[PDB]
Amino acid sequence: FVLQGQWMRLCTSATESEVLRGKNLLRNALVSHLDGTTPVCEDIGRSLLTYGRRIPLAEWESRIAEVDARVVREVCSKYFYDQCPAVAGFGPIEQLPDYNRIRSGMFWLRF
Amino acid sequence: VSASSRWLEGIRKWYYNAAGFNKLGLMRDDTIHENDDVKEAIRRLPENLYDDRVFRIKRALDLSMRQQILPKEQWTKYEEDKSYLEPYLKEVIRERKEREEWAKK
Amino acid sequence: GRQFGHLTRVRHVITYSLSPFEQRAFPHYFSKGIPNVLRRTRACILRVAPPFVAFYLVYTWGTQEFEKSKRKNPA
Amino acid sequence: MLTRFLGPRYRQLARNWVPTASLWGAVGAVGLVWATDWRLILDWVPYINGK
Amino acid sequence: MLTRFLGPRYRQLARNWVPTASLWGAVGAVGLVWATDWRLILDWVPYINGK
Amino acid sequence: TNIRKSHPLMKIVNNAFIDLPAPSNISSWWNFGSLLGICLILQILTGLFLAMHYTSDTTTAFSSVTHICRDVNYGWIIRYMHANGASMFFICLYMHVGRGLYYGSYTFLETWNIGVILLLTVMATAFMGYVLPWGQMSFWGATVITNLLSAIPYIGTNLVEWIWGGFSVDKATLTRFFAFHFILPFIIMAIAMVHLLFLHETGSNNPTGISSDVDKIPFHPYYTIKDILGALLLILALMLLVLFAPDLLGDPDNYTPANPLNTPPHIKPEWYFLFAYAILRSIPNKLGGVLALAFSILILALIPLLHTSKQRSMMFRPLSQCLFWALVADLLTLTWIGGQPVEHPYITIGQLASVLYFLLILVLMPTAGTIENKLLKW
Amino acid sequence: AEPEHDHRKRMGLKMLLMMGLLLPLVYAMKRHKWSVLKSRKLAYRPPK
Amino acid sequence: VAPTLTARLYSLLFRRTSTFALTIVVGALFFERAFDQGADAIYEHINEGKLWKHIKHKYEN
Ligand code: HEC
Ligand code: HEC
Numbered sequence: 001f002v003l004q005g006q007w008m009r010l011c012t013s014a015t016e017s018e019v020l021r022g023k024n025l026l027r028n029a030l031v032s033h034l035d036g037t038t039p040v041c042e043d044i045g046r047s048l049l050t051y052g053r054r055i056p057l058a059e060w061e062s063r064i065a066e067v068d069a070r071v072v073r074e075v076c077s078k079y080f081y082d083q084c085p086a087v088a089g090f091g092p093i094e095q096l097p098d099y100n101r102i103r104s105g106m107f108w109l110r111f
Numbered sequence: 112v113s114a115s116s117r118w119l120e121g122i123r124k125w126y127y128n129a130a131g132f133n134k135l136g137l138m139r140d141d142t143i144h145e146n147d148d149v150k151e152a153i154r155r156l157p158e159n160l161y162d163d164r165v166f167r168i169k170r171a172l173d174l175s176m177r178q179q180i181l182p183k184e185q186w187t188k189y190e191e192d193k194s195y196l197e198p199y200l201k202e203v204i205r206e207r208k209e210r211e212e213w214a215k216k
Numbered sequence: 217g218r219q220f221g222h223l224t225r226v227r228h229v230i231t232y233s234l235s236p237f238e239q240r241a242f243p244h245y246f247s248k249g250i251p252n253v254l255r256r257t258r259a260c261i262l263r264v265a266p267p268f269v270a271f272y273l274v275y276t277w278g279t280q281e282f283e284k285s286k287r288k289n290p291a
Numbered sequence: 292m293l294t295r296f297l298g299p300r301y302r303q304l305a306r307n308w309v310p311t312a313s314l315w316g317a318v319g320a321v322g323l324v325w326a327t328d329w330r331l332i333l334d335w336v337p338y339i340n341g342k
Numbered sequence: 343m344l345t346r347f348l349g350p351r352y353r354q355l356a357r358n359w360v361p362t363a364s365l366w367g368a369v370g371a372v373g374l375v376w377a378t379d380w381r382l383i384l385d386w387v388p389y390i391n392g393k
Numbered sequence: 394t395n396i397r398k399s400h401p402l403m404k405i406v407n408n409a410f411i412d413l414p415a416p417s418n419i420s421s422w423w424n425f426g427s428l429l430g431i432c433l434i435l436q437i438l439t440g441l442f443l444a445m446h447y448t449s450d451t452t453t454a455f456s457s458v459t460h461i462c463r464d465v466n467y468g469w470i471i472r473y474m475h476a477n478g479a480s481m482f483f484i485c486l487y488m489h490v491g492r493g494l495y496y497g498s499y500t501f502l503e504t505w506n507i508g509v510i511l512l513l514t515v516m517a518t519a520f521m522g523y524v525l526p527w528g529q530m531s532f533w534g535a536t537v538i539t540n541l542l543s544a545i546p547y548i549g550t551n552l553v554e555w556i557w558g559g560f561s562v563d564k565a566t567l568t569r570f571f572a573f574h575f576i577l578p579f580i581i582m583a584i585a586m587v588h589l590l591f592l593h594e595t596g597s598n599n600p601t602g603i604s605s606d607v608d609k610i611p612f613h614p615y616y617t618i619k620d621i622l623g624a625l626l627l628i629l630a631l632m633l634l635v636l637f638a639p640d641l642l643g644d645p646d647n648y649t650p651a652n653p654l655n656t657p658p659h660i661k662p663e664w665y666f667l668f669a670y671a672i673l674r675s676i677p678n679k680l681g682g683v684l685a686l687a688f689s690i691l692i693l694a695l696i697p698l699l700h701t702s703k704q705r706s707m708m709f710r711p712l713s714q715c716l717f718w719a720l721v722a723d724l725l726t727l728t729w730i731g732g733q734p735v736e737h738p739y740i741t742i743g744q745l746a747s748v749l750y751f752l753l754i755l756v757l758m759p760t761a762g763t764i765e766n767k768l769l770k771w
Numbered sequence: 772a773e774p775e776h777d778h779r780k781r782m783g784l785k786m787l788l789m790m791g792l793l794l795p796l797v798y799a800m801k802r803h804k805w806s807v808l809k810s811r812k813l814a815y816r817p818p819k
Numbered sequence: 820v821a822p823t824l825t826a827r828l829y830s831l832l833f834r835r836t837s838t839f840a841l842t843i844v845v846g847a848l849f850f851e852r853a854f855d856q857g858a859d860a861i862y863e864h865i866n867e868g869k870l871w872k873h874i875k876h877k878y879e880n
């Protein structure tokens with residue numbers, strides 16, 4: 001319920017403030033991730049496969065800095081809103097919501 | 112040994128096919144009414160028999176929902192039908208009837 | 217009452233499912249449907265039909281007989 | 292399916308609750324007598340035949 | 343006692359739910375228009391003035 | 394967390410109609426529960442909108458209903474909807490008790506037992522109902538049914554007058570009745586909720602009779618939508634009646650204003666009482682005949698005690714399956730007999746169907762159940 | 772006896788043409804939501 | 820035009836539960852006209868001279 005209602009809140013009514021938090025959290029993840037020979041090497045190697053470049057940290061900052069609440073509500077709604085999810089479930093899963101009811105969770109009636 | 116007890120057997124095999132729980136992969140012991148005596152004997156079933164029982168019923172209620180039936184191949188052969196519950200059920204009733212005689216004195 | 221999570225114990229069973237926006241609501245509706253209803257009727261006729269034909273013949277007789285009973289022919 | 296309830300103890304325990312069950316019909320009838328003013332019975336009772 | 347609800351975030355979040363709330367009165371009135379057959383309004387609508 | 398789960402009121406709704414585990418599995422024969430509900434409020438609504446115009450005095454009681462159909466804007470739909478609603482309420486009752494018997498549902502004692510109390514109550518209501526326009530079927534309706542109490546040893550007479558408003562069916566009888574017919578459906582609604590509370594304790598039985606704990610599904614969205622199609626189909630079978638054949642399942646006697654001097658030749662109750670009518674006039678005893686009618690319905694009370702089969706449902710029991718449809722057809726037989734006058738074959742066949750009903754249920758079905766036990770080595 | 776006659780037959784036509792739209796659409800609505808359940812595939816995978 | 824139109828419908832009208840509801844409400848008004856027209860006119864055509872709407876011209880003013 002809570003995970004789904006989160007997705008939807010962010011689809012519809014992402015405030016300005018939390019997006020700056022996420023932006024910082026992401027910057028902090030990024031710099032911190034590229035710590036020492038092994039991460040940076042892995043990121044060189046992978047990046048050239050997947051982007052055909054290495055994308056310089058400043059470019060990521062640029063790409064991050066662009067994003068705000070609208071850029072969230074937009075890009076969330078595009079991917080999340082009223083979309084069929086894939087669910088996988090394992091172990092004691094009697095109470096795992098029926099798929100219809102999960103898929104109902106993928107949009108708000110109020111919106 | 113007998114022509115006639117092979118006939119009571121043929122009547123029994125008829126009624127079995129006719130009842131048609133087989134048709135949904137069920138066994139006779141899947142179909143039993145759950146009372147207290149029955150409920151406990153399900154409690155007493157070993158892990159595998161229990162897990163096999165839940166699957167049979169799950170498969171059947173699924174078919175019953177979609178108003179279907181198995182391939183004839185996949186039905187439960189009368190001879191192949193194991194009264195896996197019988198001994199447990201009997202032991203339960205046996206224990207209950209003891210408690211019942213004791214309650215009488 | 218009784219609630220999901222607290223119903224019964226179930227081990228080792230994989231359910232595969234599909235979203236209704238991924239699949240037909242009416243799939244092989246006459247291709248597969250008509251063969252089934254036949255099969256289901258075939259399945260049940262000899263239990264369901266005979267009491268109602270039993271009623272049928274007792275109705276059409278009792279009608280025939282009642283109004284023929286309110287008649288004379290000689291004297 | 293009441294075979295269960297036939298044994299020495301059960302007859303002791305019925306025999307126990309008999310004077311009580313006796314009196315409970317005494318309560319119940321005399322109440323019905325009074326509540327309907329049953330006429331037929333109450334004529335027998337001195338004082339209470341108020342006619 | 344509603345001082346709580348006055349800040350930058352709250353105005354962002356109202357500004358978020360504005361086009362929606364706009365349309366919800368569009369839904370609600372036009373429904374009331376149709377359900378009462380409001381005469382006064384519906385004369386304006388081509389096709390629907392059936393007189 | 395979800396408001397739907399914890400708010401004291403919404404709680405109740407969610408536990409009953411949203412998150413409630415139903416079987417994956419229950420079929421159309423389960424739709425009657427809800428359609429009975431849909432019947433109870435549809436009867437409450439039209440019944441209300443009718444009560445706004447009806448009057449309960451004899452000298453005006455016919456004339457008021459006429460007033461309704463012809464003058465009261467849409468009083469006709471509002472009325473024939475109400476009158477057909479009632480038979481529709483009966484098609485559902487009989488189908489629901491049908492499903493209950495076939496499939497072993499009676500095992501749940503208090504639920505079925507409440508449900509028996511429900512049936513009597515709704516019978517009693519619909520009788521009072523057709524009395525109200527004060528037609529021919531109404532008067533001898535109110536006459537014959539009350540007079541049943543006269544068969545009680547020593548005290549029956551007094552009661553028959555006590556409910557009547559004195560010495561025969563009169564003014565004091567219609568007013569009386571209108572009040573009872575108003576209060577009883579609300580009482581029904583109370584008992585239906587008690588019925589539900591007891592049901593939801595176990596959750597629903599299913600076509601197999603094997604426990605569906607192993608495959609439960611949330612009521613919403615599956616049985617909200619299966620229930621809606623079901624409800625629509627009820628509105629079809631209702632609206633077909635009201636809009637094409639309003640008079641079909643009623644006597645035209647009720648269209649003649651009550652004459653306490655007539656009693657028409659081709660007399661009968663409403664169709665849903667025709668099975669029962671047959672049963673009671675098949676005995677040339679006052680005392681015997683009524684005691685046959687009582688036992689006609691209060692038999693349902695006994696059904697659980699006569700369960701015999703090691704299996705719950707009838708789904709895998711062809712002997713019992715056969716004797717079941719023998720019961721349905723026999724009941725159709727008694728409906729049909731109820732519909733014919735007390736003359737030549739009609740009499741004997743009617744006595745036989747009477748004996749057959751009480752045979753099938755009391756003796757034939759318990760034995761058939763036991764034979765299948767011995768057939769499965771059980 | 773019945774002045775409503777032609778009014779009721781008029782509503783009846785609508786009822787018939789309306790049901791004729793709704794019944795397939797309500798059916799299509801149920802058939803949809805149960806489509807998840809109607810096409811579900813079970814596999815049982817116990818040890819040994 | 821003949822495939823990518825259920826699409827066009829969905830983007831513009833069906834995504835938002837507002838515009839969804841607006842569509843059903845705006846759509847219902849237009850439907851109530853077209854139905855009470857068409858069906859009344861179907862009901863006309865099946866009688867053609869049984870009804871006072873056709874007789875009207877007989878008894879003037
Ligand atoms: C299905 C049981 C049933 C229920 C529930 C019920 N009615 Fe009736 N009622 C009937 C029947 C039957 C008639 C008689 C129909 C007929 O023949 O005209 C009727 C007739 C009436 C009439 C007289 C007008 C007429 O059509 O004959 C009134 C007034 C009325 N009911 C009020 C109520 C009210 C108020 C309620 C809600 C408390 C109610 N009814 C619910 C069975 C019921
Ligand atoms: C003589 C018994 C009987 C009568 C009459 C009866 N009920 Fe029931 N009802 C039951 C039983 C037993 C079930 C259990 C359903 C099952 O498990 O198959 C039930 C089921 C239901 C259900 C659950 C839906 C379903 O059918 O499974 C509802 C709702 C319902 N009843 C309401 C009603 C209403 C409303 C009435 C009319 C006042 C009524 N019942 C008449 C005994 C009956």
Ligand SMILES: CCCCCCCCCCCC1=C(O)C(=O)c2scnc2C1=O
Binds near residue numbers: 530531537663666
């Ligand atoms: C639950 C309380 C008991 C009330 C239930 C009523 C049972 C229905 C039996 C039908 C009785 C009946 C007759 O016997 C009869 O002769 C006539 S002539 C017009 N109506 C009836 C009539 O309704």
Ligand SMILES: COC1=C(OC)C(=O)C(C/C=C(\C)CCC=C(C)C)=C(C)C1=O
Binds near residue numbers: 410
């Ligand atoms: C799984 O079993 C159940 C059903 O599916 C077979 C139902 O459809 C309903 C629906 C009940 C309704 C609409 C109540 C109407 C009655 C009153 C008195 C308001 C209930 C509760 C239920 O338990």
